[model samples]
Target: EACKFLHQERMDVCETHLHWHTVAKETCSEKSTNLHDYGMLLPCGIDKFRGVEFVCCPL
Candidate 1:
């Protein structure tokens, strides 16, 4: 729910990973206009699971 050791100082990551929820996937799509560059789907964040946040968007 919060930033770990490596990301301790990242407020952006903190805001996202901590409060984002199951519906954040919709936001992710809205954030990306280009679904794919070349035969690949656009990256976006989906949801969290087992303390890990799953994202297809740029890391």
Candidate 2:
């Protein structure tokens, strides 16, 4: 329940699976704060994705 509430409140404001690698450098500077605390680690290479588009690869 606590995790769910945090997820809802922070969904857009927090880092998502899609935004992990790209946004990490900018948004994930803080360790104890930010979305990394929510368990959204960087996506592994060659992971299968559906209905998703990559505008450009992360640097």
Candidate 2: tens digits of C-alpha lDDT, residues 4-58: 1122122223344555444442343332223323334333345522221222211
Candidate 2: deviation at residue 32, Å? 17
Residue 44 lDDT, candidate 1, scale 0-100? 36
RMSD of each: 13.1, 11.9
Candidate 1, 1-59: lDDT as tens digits:
22111111222332334333322443345555211211112223563222223343532
Regions of candidate 2 where Cα sits further than 4 Å from its true position: 1-9, 12-18, 28-59
Model 1 error, position 42 (Å)? 29
Cα error, candidate 2, residue 20 (Å)? 1.3
How far out, in Å, is residue 29 in model 1? 0.3
lDDT of 1 at 39: 15
lDDT value for model 1:
0.30
